[PDB]
């Protein structure tokens, strides 16, 4: 399948880190505002005023020079969020300058986006978007709002949980700007369902 992506990080409460998003064994892991993770997934978003806000180690990183793992909030053609909380994707760049690397993300929350296939990559510093629950976290985040920093020395600011995704975007990314791609559905990797503690029931048959 063919899609198109854009990046972000908005500090809010993983969509799929409520119960009843999908056929999983625990939905994603939240974190307080002081990056530790959080034992109810009933609580509130921070970006509804709550205490849940997403973990940094949500962030995305390399694993080779040709493969990087990650996470993004999705929006699939004509599928619901049932589909692919904590389901995870391989993506081939075809275009920017990544054209060719391959990164496995597991989706933890849902885009906003009808009609496409969408993967809004996360990235601390990326750009808060449409919400900001960095702001009540920590005092935000620098940036435009879509888009986030141009530079990875503006990443020495940021909280130091968030700072290896943030300069991740302009190393191993070599700050592509939403390149697309070509992806298949596939097995999480361990590193994944490690971070967020959320395993589909369907995972294992897919290679």
């Known amino acids: 399948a063919n899609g198109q992506s854009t990046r972000y990080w ?7 880190g409520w119960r009843g998003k999908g056929p999983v064994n625990q939905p994603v892991y939240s974190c307080d505002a002081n990056f530790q993770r959080i034992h109810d997934f009933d609580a509130v978003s921070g970006c509804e005023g709550g205490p849940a806000f997403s973990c940094a180690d949500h962030s995305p990183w390399a694993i080779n020079d040709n493969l990087s793992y990650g996470f993004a909030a999705t929006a699939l053609s004509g599928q619901t969020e049932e589909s692919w909380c904590c389901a995870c ?7 920017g300058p ?25 990235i601390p510093g990326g750009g808060v978007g449409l919400f900001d629950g960095c702001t009540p976290q920590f005092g935000g985040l620098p940036g435009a709002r879509y888009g986030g920093i141009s530079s990875r020395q503006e990443c020495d600011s940021f909280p130091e949980p968030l700072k290896p995704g943030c300069q991740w975007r302009f190393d191993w990314f070599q700050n592509a700007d939403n390149p697309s791609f070509t992806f298949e559905r ?15 029931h369907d995972d294992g048959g897919f290679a």
């Open 98 to 122: 990544v054209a060719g690397k391959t990164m496995v993300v597991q989706s933890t929350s849902t885009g906003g986006d009808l009609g496409s296939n969408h993967f809004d990559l996360n």
């Open 186 to 200: 596939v097995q999480c990797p361990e590193e994944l369902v490690a971070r967020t503690g959320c395993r589909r």
């Open 89 to 95: 994707y391989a993506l081939t760049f075809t275009s």
């Open 10 to 16: 908005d500090c809010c409460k993983p969509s799929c």
